[PDB]
């Protein structure tokens, strides 16, 4: 595997840029919070 990329650096940089651009497109649409849905969900019947 590694020996394949030692002679094909452009392929390595292409996979790197693929990951980099997908992460940069993904970050904005990622919700933010102080904690995840960690506390058990409650259904209140008033």
């Amino acid at each position: 595997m590694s020996q394949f990329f030692i002679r094909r650096p452009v392929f390595a940089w292409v996979i790197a840029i693929f990951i980099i651009i997908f992460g940069l497109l993904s970050i904005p649409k990622l919700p933010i919070a102080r904690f995840p849905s960690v506390a058990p969900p409650q259904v209140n019947i008033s």
């Binding site: 452009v10 392929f11 940089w13 292409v14 840029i17």
Partner: protein
């Protein structure tokens, strides 16, 4: 969202090309042909 679909699609094709032919010039030469196809497409649409 017609610009991002053409901006992202073109970039995907460029990166795949560079991966496939281990170079940065070959994918540029392949990308340089897209405006000609769009050219005809626009020509046909305007004419019709």
């Amino acid at each position: 969202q017609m610009a991002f679909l053409l901006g992202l699609s073109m970039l995907v094709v460029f990166l795949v090309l560079a991966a496939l032919y281990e170079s940065w010039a070959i994918p540029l030469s392949v990308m340089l042909v897209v405006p000609l196809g769009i050219f005809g497409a626009i020509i046909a649409i305007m004419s019709r």
